[PDB]
UniProtKB/Swiss-Prot annotation, chain B:
InterPro entries in the record: Kunitz_inhibitor_STI-like_sf (IPR011065), Prot_inh_Kunz-lg (IPR002160)
Origin species: Hordeum vulgare (Barley)
Pfam families recorded: Kunitz_legume
GO molecular function, one term: serine-type endopeptidase inhibitor activity
Disulfide bonds: 44-91, 145-149
Protein name, as recorded: Alpha-amylase/subtilisin inhibitor
UniProtKB keywords: Alpha-amylase inhibitor, Disulfide bond, Protease inhibitor, Serine protease inhibitor, Signal
The protein's role, per its UniProt record: This protein inhibits independently subtilisin and alpha-amylase.
Gene3D superfamilies, alphabetized: 2.80.10.50
Stored SUPFAM superfamilies: STI-like (SSF50386)
Domain of life assignment: Eukaryota
Keyword check for Signal: yes
UniProt-annotated site: Reactive bond, residues: 68-69
Length: 108, 181
């Protein structure tokens, strides 16, 4: 359920797609060298199932920095909540409970 | 080769957990070492700030590895560590650094004293010394690495005011000058 984005072109496709389906998009901006970021992977992977009607994308900031500098993302991990092109809210850090919570409020 | 290499001071020697160092600017035309200072109407705790005078070394810090103390007591790159000032504080409390869990003035600052808004991990005080692309020998950047990874930079209001160390870009390039015991 967690789709990793590997190119700027792939990113645009995923966003446009989810938009046509009027779905909620949750995005995890990661770093493989960042301890706090790895820890949140399972928590993100699990919530990926907890809500199938939302789209979960994984973006490595070392690979697609332009996407991070576009949404003002300077810390990792950072979870972004989007819908129809506009950001609705974001969670900064490995704050599990604040994640597992803000997801229900925007998804359901 | 597998383990992270040691961090080095301005004299080329390895950093030790039993010694003190000034955290100087690599480019002295951008200010001096780091110190403590109150800010934004606050009296306490003191904020970690940067002395604007390139001739000043600021206050010395003591660096301790976060996990188990290595037998060599050597400070290494990409390794969690704790940082605290070895200097007097008018707020008479802890001089150890921790990232401000709050967003004062719309900015995350590095502060000292007691942790007033703790986190489930107790890692607000975790930092790392790192290298970067195109970095000169003996030059480094500092990062918050507790519940996130973020570069530390310096907030400067050129209109006249204290300069504070916090989470922002671009990161502050520093060198470590061994301080007299």
């Amino acid at each position: 359920e967690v789709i990793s984005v590997h190119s700027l072109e792939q990113w645009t496709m995923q966003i446009e797609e989810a938009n046509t389906a009027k779905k909620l998009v949750v995005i995890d901006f990661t770093a493989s060298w960042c301890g706090p970021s790895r820890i949140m992977a399972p928590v993100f992977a699990d919530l990926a199932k907890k809500f199938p009607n939302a789209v979960f994308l994984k973006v490595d900031v070392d690979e697609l920095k332009p996407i991070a500098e576009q949404f003002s993302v300077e810390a990792m991990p950072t979870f972004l909540f989007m819908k129809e092109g506009d950001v609705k809210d974001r969670v900064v850090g490995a704050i599990k409970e604040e994640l597992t919570a803000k997801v229900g409020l925007h998804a359901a | 080769a597998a383990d992270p290499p040691p961090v080095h001071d301005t004299d080329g020697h390895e950093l030790r957990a039993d010694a003190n160092y000034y955290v100087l600017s690599a480019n002295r035309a951008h200010g001096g070492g780091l110190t403590m200072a109150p800010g934004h109407g606050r009296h306490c705790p003191l904020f970690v700030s940067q002395d604007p005078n390139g001739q000043h070394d600021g206050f010395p810090v003591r660096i301790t590895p976060y996990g188990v103390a290595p037998s060599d007591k050597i400070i290494r790159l990409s390794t969690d560590v704790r940082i605290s000032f070895r200097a007097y504080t008018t707020c008479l409390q802890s001089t150890e650094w921790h990232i401000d869990s709050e967003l004062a003035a719309g900015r995350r600052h590095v502060i000292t004293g007691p942790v007033k808004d703790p986190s489930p991990s107790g890692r607000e005080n975790a930092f790392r010394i790192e290298k970067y692309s195109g970095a000169e020998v003996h030059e480094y950047k500092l990062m918050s690495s507790g519940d996130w990874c973020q570069d530390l930079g310096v907030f400067r209001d050129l209109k006249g005011g204290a300069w504070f160390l916090g989470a922002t870009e671009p990161y502050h390039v520093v060198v470590f000058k061994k301080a007299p015991p």
